[PDB]
Design a protein around this ligand. Structure first.
Ligand code: PCG
Ligand code: PCG
Lengths: 227, 226
DNA sequence: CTAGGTAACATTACTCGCG
DNA sequence: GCGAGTAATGTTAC
DNA sequence: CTAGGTAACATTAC
DNA sequence: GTAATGTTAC
């Protein structure tokens, strides 16, 4: 593992070959059995993680028992850099829900590498901005929209992840998220998220078959807004 | 204006004197009458804004009519850098609700300056992280808490907007936010935000006088949990 | 006063191992 | 070439 | 079933 | 005469 394989991961995408070949022989392997906490929120964060295999959910848990799924990263994903760069503790909880393998990079090595190549800093920044945006958008979703609009916006964002700058009239998508997963991402209840999804398929928005959802972009924009 | 005066603003706080004096003769003045839109969300963002005076609210509007107050920046605040660094459009709407004056810095000048001094990049990054955190925390507040807990957490965070450090048992703070302001920050309704605040003062949490609120950190942590 | 949350229950689909 | 734990998906009455 | 939301009105504040 | 809280009902 050393060359154009690292470009797949965020931030590394904008790397030059000089900074990207070498600087990846400072990543140690690490794997986690299904359902294991990689770390907690309070943990000191002196390292960063790339994901090669498995599904790792990053989430926030309140003492009462309620959970908020931040994200469900998978292959080609990168997390664990905020607590790194920024000298504070971890801001979320990382838990592997299946057998997950990935590479690990230390704090000093990474910060010394940012000091080594200035433009890599840019990369980081551009990535951070992006993250912020995705988060803030989600904020809006949960602040100013009902459940149906919430799931509609979720599906639109998930399709815009795959096709990020075109976008058809009908598009299928292979989900890999349970309805409890959705309800926890959007801060709602599983039964009522199920209701909302069935309501959307019965309003002519999305047709849902074994593992697949054909989304009708038209009615989904009509549902994610009013008229 | 070319002094330790720039330190006050975020990001500039971690600046060295060499990068911070000079720097700042590439900032043009601009002022906005009360209630004027500085820009919108869709606008191309090729510049950044520092705030010297007035109160500028950054917020998100949905087409239906519902609003979410992001932030209520004021003197010594800095915004307008995300659309800059990151080549996308603006991510929020900036509107001055009073006569506001502040300095403006162009896109190319700022990015060329980050290319000039590498550590300034680090400054930006740490600032960004911070922002992210503040946002995400707010996310949690509105996802997993009722109204009373929401306002309790808001008051706790705001009293860290001052003593970031320490934190007593009873502390006063001079708000400068209406109850509609609060309800719009936390995505709620003004009447019910009023109810929640009165409920907190009647539960022994906060005593509220003309412009001031004495907060009882103890009962406020008890209210922001359970 | 409507949109939701929480506690129960009834199907329906996977998923192992043993084999 | 089976059953035993789950786990996901809907539904209901508060 | 219940916070939180809508409209409409009431008691204070150069 | 204002902007602002508090209230009520539903
Ligand atoms: N607040 C927040 N943290 C995230 C998000 N996605 C992943 N994380 C991770 O939560 C992790 C907490 O500590 P880190 O600084 O090491 O790295 C962080 C982030 O990379 C997100 O969308 N919001
Ligand atoms: N998404 C988001 N934007 C913010 C926030 N605070 C201020 N803004 C500003 O909204 C503005 C939109 O475009 P910019 O990139 O020019 O700069 C941005 C941010 O600085 C915040 O907390 N979240």
């Amino acid at each position: 593992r050393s060359s154009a394989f690292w470009r797949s991961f965020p931030i590394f995408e904008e790397f030059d070959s000089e900074t990207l070949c070498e600087l990846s022989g400072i990543a140690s392997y690490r794997k986690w059995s299904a359902g294991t906490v990689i770390f907690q929120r309070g943990d000191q964060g002196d390292y960063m993680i790339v994901v090669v295999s498995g599904r790792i959910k990053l989430s926030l848990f309140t003492p009462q028992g309620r959970e908020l799924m931040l994200r469900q990263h998978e292959a080609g994903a990168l997390f664990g850099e905020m607590a790194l760069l920024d000298g504070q503790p971890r801001s979320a909880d990382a838990t592997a829900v299946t057998a997950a393998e990935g590479y690990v990079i230390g704090k000093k090595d990474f910060l010394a590498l940012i000091t080594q190549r200035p433009k890599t800093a840019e990369a980081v920044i551009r990535f951070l901005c992006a993250q912020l945006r995705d988060t803030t958008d989600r904020l809006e979703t949960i602040a100013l929209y009902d459940l149906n609009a919430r799931v509609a916006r979720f599906f639109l964002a998930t399709l815009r992840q795959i096709h990020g700058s075109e976008m058809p009239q009908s598009a299928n998508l292979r989900l890999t998220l349970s309805q409890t997963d959705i309800a926890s991402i959007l801060g709602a209840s599983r039964p009522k998220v199920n209701r909302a999804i069935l309501s959307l398929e019965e309003s002519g928005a999305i047709k849902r078959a074994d593992g697949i959802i054909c989304c009708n972009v038209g009615r989904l924009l009509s549902i994610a807004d009013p008229e």
